[PDB]
């Protein structure tokens, strides 16, 4: 019941919206693909 629909080209856009922090975090990745913070 799953289908796909084209949404756009894979292109860099000159002068795009710029947002978001850049945190540095210690993490562990378990067998289930779950990231978790570590200290």
């Amino acid at each position: 019941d799953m289908y796909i629909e084209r949404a756009g080209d894979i292109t860099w856009e000159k002068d795009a919206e710029v947002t978001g922090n850049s945190p540095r975090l210690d993490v562990a990745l378990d067998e289930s693909g779950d990231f978790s913070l570590v200290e």
């Binding site: 796909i4 629909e5 949404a7 756009g8 860099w12 919206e17 978001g20 850049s22 993490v27 562990a28």
Partner: protein, 151 residues
């Protein structure tokens, strides 16, 4: 078949569960979007070919093709495809998931869950990873790994 970014929909009513990347005739998304189910593409059927739950990635019709990686310095662009919204580029400078197996770029952007699988791009337009597997740091501040596979 044609290269591009795609919505991943499911069928009453149609919902967007994810996003993926078509490249070199292979469709790439994250495992938790499709759980490896077959995808319909027009009259055609895309069958899962490679998948890994730990990486949370899956490729259809062939092996994983995307191999570009974050340079650790430059801003990137999340090519977000939110449900009901046209594709839009969000520029950001990645933070870093530091793991015992090395550093993985990460983007502190919080888009609806149907945006999982959206490609993250470098300045040449190469897909350096997919959006939507990550961690929360404090009160829903979601940060997504830049998840990339092996070619």
């Amino acid at each position: 078949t044609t290269d591009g970014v795609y919505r991943v929909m499911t069928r009453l009513g149609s919902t967007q569960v994810g996003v993926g990347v078509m490249q070199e005739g292979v469709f790439h998304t994250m495992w938790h979007v499709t759980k490896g189910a077959a995808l319909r593409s027009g009259e055609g059927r895309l069958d899962p070919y490679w998948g890994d739950v730990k990486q949370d990635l899956v490729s259809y019709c062939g092996p994983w093709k995307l191999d570009a990686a974050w340079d650790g310095l430059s801003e990137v662009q999340l090519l977000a495809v939110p449900p009901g919204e046209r594709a839009k580029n969000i520029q950001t400078l990645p933070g870093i998931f530091k793991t015992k197996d090395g550093d993985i770029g990460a983007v502190a952007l919080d888009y609806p869950a149907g945006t999982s699988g959206s490609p993250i791009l470098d300045k040449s337009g190469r897909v350096i990873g997919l959006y939507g597997n990550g961690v929360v740091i404090k009160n829903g501040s979601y940060v997504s790994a830049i998840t990339q596979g092996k070619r």
